[PDB]
Every structure is written in structure tokens, then in C-alpha cells.
Amino acid sequence: SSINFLTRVTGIGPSAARKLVDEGIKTLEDLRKNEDKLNHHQRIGLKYFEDFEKRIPREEMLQMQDIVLNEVKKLDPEYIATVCGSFRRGAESSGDMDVLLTHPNFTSESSKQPKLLHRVVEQLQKVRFITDTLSKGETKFMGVCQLPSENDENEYPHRRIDIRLIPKDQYYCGVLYFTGSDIFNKNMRAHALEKGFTINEYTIRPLGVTGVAGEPLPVDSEQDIFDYIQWRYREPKDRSE
Known part of the structure; x- marks a missing residue:
């Protein structure tokens, strides 16, 4: 029951949830005053609980795809960026944005190269599109973004976004x-x-x-x-x- 409500904030898996439900933390007001018990991911997950339950319309998806594609093309024209998921298949609504990223310098016969994915993240942060980070990996970024609202925050809920770096030869x-x-x-x-x-x-x-x-x-x-x-x-x- 409460340990079902808890699996709903991103970050909180069933194990994490059994432990917080046992330590007496079983409601949104309880978690909201128990940030110290949570890791960075669950806490940004709690921070935008309400916004992550809202669906994203094709209209906003298309603008978000544009910001990503324009900024990435500026950093390096050889970077290939593809927003995948139901949205690429023409869905009128999406739950999040999944951007697959590659670069000819990066193939599966190569060592790590984190700066290829991090430079983009950092340019999406600087242009104020990526607003927070759940988890930054060498080949994978899960974060949150927001469309430029330009008045009293506007109906731009915060949306989930994933950017994965894939070897060119497996892309x-x-x-x-x-x-x-x-x-x-x-x-x-x-x-x-x-x-x-x-x-x-x-x-x-x-x-x-x-x-x-x-x-x-x-x-x-x-x-x-x-x-x-x-x-x-x-x-x-x-x-x-």
C-alpha cells in the first residue's frame, strides 16, 4: 500500500521503499521532511513528483527536440542526435524524452570517452534546458529539463530526459x-x-x-x-x- 505509493517517486525502487516504509516514512509529507534519508536521485524524484506524473504533448516534445538538436549541432556537426520512443513513431503524447547520441570518434573498439556525452549535458545546462541531474554516468545521463517559460514559471512542468552515448557502429x-x-x-x-x-x-x-x-x-x-x-x-x- 504506502510501499506502492513510494515506488511512484522516481529513484525509489521496492527495496528502498521497504526500508523507508519500515523506518516510519510512508506518505508524501513524511518523505518531504526526510530528505536526509534519500540519495540525490530520489530527492530530485521527490522534488518534481507532481510534474513527472504529467504527460508531455507532441507540441512541447517537438520544441524540446529542437533545442537539443540545435545545441548539439553547434558543439560539433558530426554528432548524430535521435529523439527515440513512442514520439519518433508519431505519438501525440510522451512520458519523457529519450535522446540516443553517437559520434564517429566513438566506436565499440574504443575506451571510455565521457567528455563526448558530458559536453552536450553541460551545454544543455548552460542554455538552461537541463535543470537537474538524477544520475550522470560516462555513457549515460538521466536528468530533468524544462522548456523556457519566460514569465511566472508558465505551464512548463519539469520533464524527464535520458541521453545515452552509443558506439557509432552499434547505433x-x-x-x-x-x-x-x-x-x-x-x-x-x-x-x-x-x-x-x-x-x-x-x-x-x-x-x-x-x-x-x-x-x-x-x-x-x-x-x-x-x-x-x-x-x-x-x-x-x-x-x-
């Missing part, structure tokens, strides 16, 4: 997977198997002997994946199927 498989549609990923994958290939969020490999996958085929576009599998390319819009 279109990542954009395919994360633009999704769960059904679609699951139908495309079964057809791949039937044509002798195994597909996942990173690569497409040819299936040899049995479970033994073989080495990764090259992919410089989503379309390359449909051609390997001999399937008419499906636009993200027709990907419910």
Missing part, C-alpha cells in the same frame, strides 16, 4: 530498438531468425551452427537492418506491427 540497431514498439521489435526479431539472423539493441549477426551467433554485420542505417532481413523498410510511423 542504428539502438535507434531501431529504442524507437521501438515492443510488438514490432518482437515481430522483426522473429522474422530475422527465420531469415537466419539474430538481432538485439546492439547488433545483427548471422546465425550459424545453433545458438552460435557469428560476428556483427555492418550497419550504417536502420534500412540496412531491413535489407539484411529482406523486409520492406518500415517507417517509424508504421511500426506498431
Whole structure:
């Protein structure tokens, strides 16, 4: 019951919740006066509880996508940025923004490179779009953003945003997977198997002997994946199927 209400503020998983519900912290006013018991993530999660339960309309998603794409293009034109999820498939509303990021200097035959993702985060912070950070990783950022409101804070709830840095050579498989549609990923994958290939969020490999996958085929576009599998390319819009 209260340890269900608690799994609702981001950051607070079931374990975290069993412990806070036992230590007597089981309501929003209780957590609101027990910040010292929470880590940075749960606390920014508590800070915008109400705003993260609000859905984001395509209208605002498109403006947010523009700010991200313009700022990233300025830092370096070779940076490829793709806002994925239901929104890329044309949804009129989204729960958050998931930006997949890559760069030709970064391939899976390379060591860490955190500055490739951090420079963007820092430029989105400086231009006052990323407002807070839940967790900053070397290849992954989960934070929060807000559209420029310019008067008494305006109806711009704070929205959740994720920016992942992917090796260039695994990027279109990542954009395919994360633009999704769960059904679609699951139908495309079964057809791949039937044509002798195994597909996942990173690569497409040819299936040899049995479970033994073989080495990764090259992919410089989503379309390359449909051609390997001999399937008419499906636009993200027709990907419910």
C-alpha cells in the first residue's frame, strides 16, 4: 500500500521503499521532511513528483527536440542526435524524452570517452534546458529539463530526459530498438531468425551452427537492418506491427 505509493517517486525502487516504509516514512509529507534519508536521485524524484506524473504533448516534445538538436549541432556537426520512443513513431503524447547520441570518434573498439556525452549535458545546462541531474554516468545521463517559460514559471512542468552515448557502429540497431514498439521489435526479431539472423539493441549477426551467433554485420542505417532481413523498410510511423 504506502510501499506502492513510494515506488511512484522516481529513484525509489521496492527495496528502498521497504526500508523507508519500515523506518516510519510512508506518505508524501513524511518523505518531504526526510530528505536526509534519500540519495540525490530520489530527492530530485521527490522534488518534481507532481510534474513527472504529467504527460508531455507532441507540441512541447517537438520544441524540446529542437533545442537539443540545435545545441548539439553547434558543439560539433558530426554528432548524430535521435529523439527515440513512442514520439519518433508519431505519438501525440510522451512520458519523457529519450535522446540516443553517437559520434564517429566513438566506436565499440574504443575506451571510455565521457567528455563526448558530458559536453552536450553541460551545454544543455548552460542554455538552461537541463535543470537537474538524477544520475550522470560516462555513457549515460538521466536528468530533468524544462522548456523556457519566460514569465511566472508558465505551464512548463519539469520533464524527464535520458541521453545515452552509443558506439557509432552499434547505433542504428539502438535507434531501431529504442524507437521501438515492443510488438514490432518482437515481430522483426522473429522474422530475422527465420531469415537466419539474430538481432538485439546492439547488433545483427548471422546465425550459424545453433545458438552460435557469428560476428556483427555492418550497419550504417536502420534500412540496412531491413535489407539484411529482406523486409520492406518500415517507417517509424508504421511500426506498431
